[PDB]
Design a protein around this ligand. Structure first.
Ligand SMILES: Nc1ccn([C@@H]2O[C@H](COP(=O)(O)OP(=O)(O)OP(=O)(O)O)[C@@H](O)[C@H]2O)c(=O)n1
Ligand SMILES: Nc1ccn([C@@H]2O[C@H](COP(=O)(O)OP(=O)(O)OP(=O)(O)O)[C@@H](O)[C@H]2O)c(=O)n1
Ligand SMILES: O=C(O)[C@@]1(O)C[C@@H](O)[C@@H](O)[C@@H]([C@H](O)CO)O1
Ligand SMILES: O=C(O)[C@@]1(O)C[C@@H](O)[C@@H](O)[C@@H]([C@H](O)CO)O1
Ligand SMILES: [Mg+2]
Ligand SMILES: [Mg+2]
Lengths: 246, 246
């Protein structure tokens, strides 16, 4: 009932060659592949631009689609896979980012289901932040929601800003921050629409691909899950933490 | 063609008693009144909760409406004024905040005009920030817009966050920052709608009354003016600056 595509370019800047970094005997990309398998997805494809990533995935028995080196985000890379596989417009695609080796299968299913149950073009998920270090870390993307759960904005800045608390000091946070997880649900037809839009100025400043959608006035629904152990892997520090936790 | 209402409660927390602070021989509230007069507004009302504010305005020949002490924002206070004056729903109201003694008359007129020409419930304005101090100052409210100029979010946080520039240092900013001005255009019918909503959690965290509107899924249009003098008076530092510049 849904397809998972995992975008995994080699030349990440904050952690070069990250799809292939070892985590307890397997490259990160293979761990993400396993989360996708566990979700029950009908088809799972790794999209990459690098032969060494392709070989690792093929050796783990996963399907691979080679894609252009000049894509500027995972979602842009997905559109090439979508065109090559010729998915119907109504086919549900879940982008599980190659930097999320600990994302639970249940969360993958939840995003697909949430998307299919709403007339929204794109669905995603966030989890509460419980410590101030993460609230003030620009590598942890924060998201602020409206009353219906649609995203107002995603940012690397600390939003929503707590005026009175932070005027005092920056060492504590209340119970109102949300960390955005690297996963998106969207139908193939929406992915097509996404790459047909001209890039927003906003997405390039924050380096957050989802801002293109908000810029063109479309909604993103964000479900909130209370507990999800682990973290995405964007820095050397993230990698050490994940190595220890898995 | 429009009514100006200036909300001015006495007990500000960041600058106590600010409607009465001396700015070069006249209290701040009287300067705001003078800006409102210059706009050509058909009627101008200062809404206050304090007799000494009332007296300063009356001594300057201005109209005063006493209002409850328990209002939690200028917009809430304006609703009491709208009922007491029994304005019709379609009456165009411009909230010129009591902390904007330097706001140009042209900007006041522009917000009223923008509101009237659009199907939108609420209109406001922002000005490009070209210095790093204001961009990183939580007393300067930043806003990020969509392609059509509707607000995605308003925040005291530094948005949009420049990932690559700021990873290096906070010394400089690009050209992508907008400072929100303390002026709102809305019809009386919208003000009535605003206070029919239960308060949002979001507005209390940021201490930004306009966030109630985004929380409940309604739009705010933001015009951008390229050049606007002065600043909002919220801190002692702002007060020194406006005293030097007015
Ligand atoms: N041009 C890009 C950038 C990102 N991705 C993929 O999208 C996912 C999420 O992006 P991110 O974690 O930020 O990866 P990078 O962009 O590669 O890393 P960095 O931002 O540090 O440069 C990653 O699996 C990455 O491989 C992609 O396919 N093409
Ligand atoms: N409960 C409130 C708070 C604000 N205002 C008015 O709304 C305008 C903008 O608010 P702000 O500049 O923040 O004033 P204060 O809320 O009074 O100051 P502070 O946030 O420092 O406590 C001001 O003219 C203020 O008098 C109001 O009428 N009632
Ligand atoms: O920079 C990352 O964290 C990634 C790429 C972004 O474009 C965006 O998808 C982001 C998510 O917000 C999760 O952090 O993941
Ligand atoms: O806090 C202020 O700056 C004021 C009160 C807020 O509720 C909001 O209206 C704000 C504007 O964003 C202008 O700064 O003005
Ligand atoms: Mg990236
Ligand atoms: Mg205030």
């Amino acid at each position: 009932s849904f397809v998972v595509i995992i975008p995994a370019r080699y030349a990440s800047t904050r952690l070069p060659g990250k799809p292939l970094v070892d985590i307890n005997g397997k490259p990160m990309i293979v761990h993400v592949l396993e989360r996708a398998r566990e979700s029950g997805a009908e088809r799972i494809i790794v999209a990459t631009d690098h032969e060494d990533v392709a070989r690792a995935v093929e050796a783990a028995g996963g399907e691979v689609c080679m894609t252009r080196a000049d894509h500027q985000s995972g979602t842009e890379r997905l559109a090439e896979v979508v065109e090559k596989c010729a998915f119907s417009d109504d086919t549900v695609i879940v982008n599980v980012q190659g930097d999320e080796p600990m994302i639970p299968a249940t969360i993958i299913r939840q995003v697909a289901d949430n998307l299919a149950q709403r007339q929204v073009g794109m669905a995603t998920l966030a989890v509460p932040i419980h410590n101030a270090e993460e609230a003030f870390n620009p590598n942890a993307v924060k998201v602020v929601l409206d009353a219906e759960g649609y995203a107002l904005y995603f940012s690397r800045a600390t939003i929503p800003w707590d005026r009175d608390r932070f005027a005092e000091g920056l060492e504590t946070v209340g119970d109102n921050f949300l960390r955005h997880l690297g996963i998106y649900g969207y139908r193939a037809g929406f992915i097509r629409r996404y790459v047909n839009w001209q890039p927003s100025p906003l997405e390039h400043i924050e380096m957050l691909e989802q801002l293109r959608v908000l810029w063109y006035g479309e909604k993103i629904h964000v479900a909130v899950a209370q507990e999800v152990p682990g973290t995405g892997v964007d820095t050397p520090e993230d990698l050490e933490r994940v190595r220890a936790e898995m």
